[PDB]
Structure 1
């Protein structure tokens, strides 16, 4: 928000306004990175981004501690080298390359289509990067009519997404990614669980309106009473949440789940790509921005 607005105070005392991305700006498949870039906490153009820029942006503007993004930073830079064909040093070339498929970006996302979702021909691909309202609605529908949801509900959401993606993706494309997705499950609980409830740290419940605002608008739900978690969330909370989601009892089982879907997941680890492997072409679509309604500087 505008620095003088005081909207972030006393949690963020140095805010910057929302600015929609333009057609030449680079955006990510990540709702967090996109919100940060929209506010210029990382470059508005989404290019040439250092590790410390990311660390400071998450810590000071989203209440996400450095520990939470340690692996994510490692993996962003691995993917940058893989996509561009050279070491990116400490300047992430852009945000868009993070949508390189079957890498950091993965199938069965909560709010993005898959790279080969619903394509008639094997060589074809689609926008697996920009926010997709219909896809997000498939996630939200699992918790329809509710204001909050718990670990068991999140487990049902990711199962629904896995089922739909396994059915809809071009045959042979779909690849399950429980470890990376469920770190992101933990990220959702870390950012938009309801800290106004007495037992939030131990038994976090996602506020659906906060989640929907963050994903749809790629800006922060201050108007709904959200603020950056204080103290900043640490990696322990995230991986504990991740484990809790996957441990939760499944009471409704979708059909067409991949083998072993129900059950614990492997620890997320650094990515690696063979030097022989050429990257998949990136979707070239202009960056998404909210238009129903468009957002003001304080939204």
Structure 2
């Protein structure tokens, strides 16, 4: 928001306006990174980003401590090298390369289509980076009619997404990725769980309207009563939530579910790519931005 508006006060006293990305700007398959870039907390064009810029943007404007993004940082730079062919040092070339399939970017996302989702030819691939309203809708349907949801509901959502992707993706493409996806499940509870509730730290409930605003608009739900969590969330909360989701009892099992989908998952670890392996081509679609309605500077 405009600095003088005082919208983020007293949680964020140094805000910047929202500015929609242009045809030449670089965006990622991450709703958190895109929101930061749209506000200029990280380069608005999504290029040449240092670890320290990432750390400060997250901590100061999203209430996310350094421990939370430690592994994400490592994996971002590992992928940069794999895609560009050379070490990226401390300057992430761009956000777009983060959408390199079967790496950090994984199948069965909550709001993006898979790289080879519903393609007639093996050589075809599609936009697995930009926000897809229809895909997000398949996530929202699971909790239709509710205002909040818990760990059990989230487990149902990720199960529905895995079933759909396993069925729609070109034969042989689908690859389950529970460790990374559920850290992201934890990210969601860390950022948009309802801190107004008495036992938010032990039994966090996600506010659906906050979640919708963030994902769809790629900006912050201040107009809805949201504010960065204070104190800043630490990695402890995220991995615990991740674990609680996969441990939640399932009351509805979808069909065509990949083997071992139900049950605990392994902890996320840094990625590694064989030097013999060539990267997949990146989708070249222009950056997505909210159009119904378009956002103003304070949205």
Instruction: Give the TM-score of the pair, scaled to structure 1.
Output: 1.00
Give a deviation string over 1:129-178, Cα, whole Å, max 9, x none. Answer: 00000000000000000000000000000000000000000000000000
| 3-state secondary structure, aligned to 2:67 | helix
Distance 2:198 2:44 in 1: 37
CA distance in 2, matches of 1:79, 1:124: 22
In 2, the alpha carbon distance for the partners of 1:263 and 1:109 equals: 18
2:112 alignment partner, SS class: coil
Deviation at 1:195, TM superposition (A): 0.4
Structure 2 length as normaliser, TM-score?
Answer: 1.00
Deviation of the 1:74 alpha carbon: 0.1
Query: Residue deviations 1:1-57, cap 9 Å, x none?
Result: 000000000000000000000000000000000000000000000000000000000
| Aligned mates of 1:33, 1:23 — CA distance in 2 | 17
User: Residues 97-120 of structure 1: CA distance to partner in whole angstroms, max 9, x if unpaired?
Assistant: 000000000000000000000000
The Cα of 1:250 is off from its aligned counterpart by 0.5
The 5 Å alignment of 1:8-87 reads 8-87=8-87
CA distance in 1, matches of 2:143, 2:23: 34
RMSD: 0.3
The C-alpha deviation readout for 1:208-240, integer Å capped at 9, x for no partner, is: 000000000000000000000000000000000
Q: Distance in 2 between matches of 1:43 and 1:198?
A: 38
Deviations 1:79-128 (A, max 9, x none): 00000000000000000000000000000000000000000000100000
The structural deviation recorded for 1:258 is 0.6
Helix, strand or coil for the counterpart of 1:48?
strand
Count of paired positions: 299
Shift of 1:73: 0.1
Aligned equivalents of 1:43, 1:182: Cα separation in 2: 28
Distance in 2, matches of 1:256 and 1:4, equals 53
Equivalent in the alignment of 1:230: 230
How far apart in 2 are the matches of 1:241 and 1:147?
19
In structure 1, distance between residues paired with 2:229 and 2:279: 37
Q: Which sections of structure 1, spanning at least 5 residues, go unmatched?
A: none
**In structure 1, what is the Cα distance between the partners aligned to 2:14 and 2:235?**
25
**How far apart, CA to CA, are the structure 2 residues paired with 1:30 and 1:228?**
18
Q: Measure the CA separation in 1 of the matches of 2:198 and 2:91.
A: 41
Rounded to whole Å, the distance in 2 between the matches of 1:278 and 1:293 is 40
Question: 1:168 corresponds to which residue?
Answer: 168
**Structure 1 residue ranges, 4+ long, deviating more than 2 angstroms after superposition:** none
Q: CA deviation at 1:259?
A: 0.7
What CA distance in whole angstroms lies between the structure 2 residues aligned with 1:141 and 1:5? 36
Q: For 1:145 and 1:78, locate their aligned partners in 2 and report how far apart those are by CA, in whole Å.
A: 41
